[PDB]
Amino acid sequence: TVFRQENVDDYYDTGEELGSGQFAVVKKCREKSTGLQYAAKFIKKRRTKSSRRGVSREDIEREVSILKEIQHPNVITLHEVYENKTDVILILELVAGGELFDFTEEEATEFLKQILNGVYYLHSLQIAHFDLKPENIMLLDRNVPRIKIIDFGLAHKIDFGNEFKNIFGTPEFVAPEIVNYEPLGLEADMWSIGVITYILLSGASPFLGDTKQETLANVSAVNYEFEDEYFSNTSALAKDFIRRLLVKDPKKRMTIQDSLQHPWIKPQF
Numbered sequence: 001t002v003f004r005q006e007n008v009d010d011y012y013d014t015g016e017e018l019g020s021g022q023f024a025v026v027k028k029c030r031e032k033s034t035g036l037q038y039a040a041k042f043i044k045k046r047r048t049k050s051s052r053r054g055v056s057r058e059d060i061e062r063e064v065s066i067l068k069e070i071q072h073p074n075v076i077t078l079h080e081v082y083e084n085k086t087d088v089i090l091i092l093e094l095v096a097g098g099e100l101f102d103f104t105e106e107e108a109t110e111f112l113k114q115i116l117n118g119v120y121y122l123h124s125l126q127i128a129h130f131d132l133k134p135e136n137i138m139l140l141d142r143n144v145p146r147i148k149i150i151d152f153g154l155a156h157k158i159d160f161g162n163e164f165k166n167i168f169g170t171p172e173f174v175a176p177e178i179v180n181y182e183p184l185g186l187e188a189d190m191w192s193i194g195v196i197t198y199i200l201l202s203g204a205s206p207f208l209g210d211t212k213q214e215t216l217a218n219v220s221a222v223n224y225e226f227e228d229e230y231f232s233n234t235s236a237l238a239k240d241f242i243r244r245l246l247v248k249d250p251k252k253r254m255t256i257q258d259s260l261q262h263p264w265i266k267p268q269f
């Protein structure tokens with residue numbers, strides 16, 4: 001699929017940098033025709049088929065295709081796509097409030113519930129995000145707060161219940177099936193939600209070791225505990241919620257629908 005080949009600079013003006021990835025940079029921008037503001041994500045293209053630098057056209061198109069499908073208040077929307085020789089440029093909704101963690105159980109669940117609603121929408125569409133972590137939970141406007149899940153760079157449509165292709169995010173947040181290079185499904189997202197919840201409530205990371213290999217070993221082993229010093233005041237129900245997500249066997253882990261009915265919620269190298 002081909003994208004808009006006119007110079008993006010003829011239609012938008014860029015401003016402050018908003019964030020980045022390995023082969024991407026995101027800048028605030030303003031559309032010349034309307035004055036509406038967006039975030040322009042410049043994704044570096046691969047220069048050759050054997051290159052390890054840049055993002056493959058296949059991967060870029062998958063992210064674009066997923067973003068086009070979704071319309072939900074808790075997920076980032078895609079406005080337009082441009083491209084040139086070096087970059088594909090996604091014109092995305094402006095999420096200007098920064099990362100959630102930068103910004104009590106009631107406060108934690110208020111944000112957690114919006115994450116759950118957004119993931120419920122995704123999973124309803126058989127879309128696994130595969131990269132859920134605090135850095136990808138943004139606040140639309142931290143001055144009003146509504147969250148927006150961002151960065152669909154690892155996201156996949158799961159049409160056969162699982163995907164088998166060495167998908168791998170950030171060691172602290174990936175499920176044991178990712179660490180062990182096994183078939184992956186929506187369940188992996190639910191693990192990552194348990195990790196996010198643990199950190200939300202405690203400011204501590206459940207599996208984090210001193211090196212990447214230690215973190216990964218800890219994840220695979222389900223080597224974590226609710227440290228009394230960090231969780232003394234936290235309700236048993238909150239811990240129960242987390243415990244049912246941080247389960248090695250994906251089949252035994254709470255689903256997104258389970259998480260919404262849970263008594264706490266219900267009203268790599």
Ligand SMILES: Nc1cc2c(nn1)-c1ccccc1CC2
Nearest residue numbers: 018019020021026039092095151
């Ligand atoms: N890797 C990243 C990183 C970011 C974003 N997307 N991908 C983003 C998208 C829309 C608005 C704001 C951002 C900030 C950081």
